[PDB]
Scaffold this active site. Structure first.
Site, short mmCIF file in Angstrom:
data_model
loop_
_atom_site.label_atom_id
_atom_site.label_comp_id
_atom_site.label_asym_id
_atom_site.label_seq_id
_atom_site.Cartn_x
_atom_site.Cartn_y
_atom_site.Cartn_z
N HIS A 150 -0.44 -1.49 -2.20
CA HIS A 150 -0.38 -0.39 -3.17
C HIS A 150 -1.71 0.01 -3.80
O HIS A 150 -1.81 1.10 -4.39
CB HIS A 150 0.59 -0.70 -4.31
CG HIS A 150 2.01 -0.89 -3.86
ND1 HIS A 150 2.65 0.00 -3.02
CD2 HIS A 150 2.90 -1.87 -4.13
CE1 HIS A 150 3.88 -0.44 -2.79
NE2 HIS A 150 4.05 -1.56 -3.45
N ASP A 177 6.16 -4.33 4.93
CA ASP A 177 6.65 -4.52 3.57
C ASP A 177 7.59 -3.32 3.30
O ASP A 177 7.31 -2.18 3.73
CB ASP A 177 5.46 -4.59 2.59
CG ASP A 177 5.91 -4.68 1.14
OD1 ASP A 177 6.58 -3.73 0.63
OD2 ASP A 177 5.61 -5.69 0.46
N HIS A 188 8.26 -1.48 0.87
CA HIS A 188 7.73 -0.41 0.00
C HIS A 188 6.61 0.33 0.72
O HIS A 188 5.97 -0.21 1.63
CB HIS A 188 7.24 -1.04 -1.30
CG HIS A 188 8.32 -1.80 -2.00
ND1 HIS A 188 8.29 -3.17 -2.14
CD2 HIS A 188 9.50 -1.39 -2.53
CE1 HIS A 188 9.40 -3.57 -2.75
NE2 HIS A 188 10.14 -2.51 -3.02
N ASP A 219 10.20 -8.22 1.83
CA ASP A 219 11.13 -7.59 0.86
C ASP A 219 12.16 -6.64 1.49
O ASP A 219 13.02 -6.10 0.78
CB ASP A 219 10.38 -6.98 -0.34
CG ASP A 219 9.08 -6.27 0.05
OD1 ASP A 219 8.77 -6.10 1.26
OD2 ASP A 219 8.37 -5.91 -0.89
#
Ligand code: 3YP
Ligand code: K
Ligand code: K
Ligand code: ZN
EC number: 3.5.1.-
Length: 367
Positions: free
Chosen positions: A142, A179, A181, A267
């Site tokens: 991120h 991941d 996200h 995740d």
């Protein structure tokens, strides 16, 4: 030889006393012992790597602290300056977005996390190691060029890819991010740059908000060298492996990277609190197997996995162990949750999943 990075300080990251944001008495957000991102989850993965015996098949690689130079290949001088600033605060604190915090001196850990990815990358590139897994923390994907975000201080895989580019002289690197996200940070950093192909699979609009649409394709010389595969909530092994087969692996083969770096979050797992996906350890196993085999075919097996997110202390260790077993070729343990999770679904490619992946296939033409 399969390299493996774990540094004790990865397990010492101070996640405060809140759940996500800080505890807050006026909001009546009661303090709690384990924040969503508490380092125990990734520590339990490391301990399973050891207790399973996998560690005996691995080559331990010491993390080295990423230098200012290393960090500046991915991030702005201003961001580096700012993290120095926040880590030098008496107690440290939150770094911008109201989740992402650092202790006083937490910069030491953020350097070791990025440097773990760099060190493993260096030694895989020299042919000392064939591949490796850097079990780093804090995570990276991120953090964009000029900020910390969503638990990420520095974009580890981008620091590694910047090193492979500038120091090792590689012309092309791929970062594959599974991941759950969106890897918005990675996408930002390499946005104008065709020399780092950035790919993200993610639950659509899970995090960050309004990010990760398939329309986000890079700009200029970098146009066509960023690929998002947003998938619907409830997507499982079938959707993920279809995305691998129809998009990811064709993209890598088309692009011809000299090195594949995987932003390996877990995740997307069936039991994760921070997304709604249904991938099991066997799904991650197959994803890792395919990507490793791809690297063997196209870039002399040069593949570096670097830990991103994952929030189930219960199940993450088994998802990570599955990836490790694909790297060592030694399959030591069953997934003890297999029977329990296998009835829940996710193993049938649903029409809406198929359609989401098909929207992406046309983008391959621009690589
Ligand atoms: O795992 C991560 C960070 C999770 C985000 C979800 C909550 C705000 C930070 N990203 O992939
Ligand atoms: K992703
Ligand atoms: K790019
Ligand atoms: Zn994540």
């Amino acid at each position: 030889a399969i390299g493996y990075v774990w540094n004790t300080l990865y397990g010492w990251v101070d996640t405060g006393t809140g759940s996500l944001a800080a505890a807050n008495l006026t909001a009546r957000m009661q303090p709690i012992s384990h924040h969503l991102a508490h380092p125990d989850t990734k520590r339990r993965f490391h301990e399973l790597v050891c207790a399973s015996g996998q560690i005996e098949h691995l080559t331990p690689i010491a993390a080295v602290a990423a230098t200012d130079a290393d960090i500046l290949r991915a991030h702005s001088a201003a961001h580096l300056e700012n993290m120095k600033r926040v880590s030098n605060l008496p107690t440290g604190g939150d770094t911008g977005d109201g989740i992402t915090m650092m202790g006083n001196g937490g910069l030491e850990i953020a350097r070791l996390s990025a440097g773990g990815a760099v060190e493993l990358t260096r030694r895989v590139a020299t042919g000392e190691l064939s591949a490796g897994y850097a079990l780093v923390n804090p995570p990276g994907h991120h953090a964009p060029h000029n900020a910390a975000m969503g638990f990420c201080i520095f974009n580890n895989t981008s620091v590694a890819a910047g090193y492979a580019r500038a120091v090792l002289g590689m012309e092309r690197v791929a970062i594959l991010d599974w991941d759950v996200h969106h890897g918005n940070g990675t996408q930002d950093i390499w946005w104008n740059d065709p020399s780092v192909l950035t790919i993200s699979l993610h639950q659509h609009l899970c995090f960050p908000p309004d990010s990760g649409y398939s329309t986000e394709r890079g700009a200029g010389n970098g146009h066509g060298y960023n690929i998002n595969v947003p998938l619907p909530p409830g997507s499982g092994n079938a959707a993920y492996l279809h995305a691998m087969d129809q998009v990811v692996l064709p993209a890598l083969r088309a692009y011809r990277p000299q090195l594949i770096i995987v932003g390996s979050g877990f995740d997307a797992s069936m039991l994760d609190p921070l997304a709604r996906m249904m991938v099991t350890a066997d799904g991650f196993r197959q994803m890792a197997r395919r990507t490793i085999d791809c690297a063997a075919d196209i870039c002399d097996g040069r593949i570096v996995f670097v830990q991103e997110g994952g929030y189930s202390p219960h199940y993450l260790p088994f998802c990570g162990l599955a990836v490790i077993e694909e790297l060592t070729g030694v399959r030591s343990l069953p997934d003890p949750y297999h029977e329990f999770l296998a009835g829940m679904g996710g193993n049938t490619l649903l029409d809406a999943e198929r359609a989401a992946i098909e929207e992406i296939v046309p983008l391959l033409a621009d690589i």
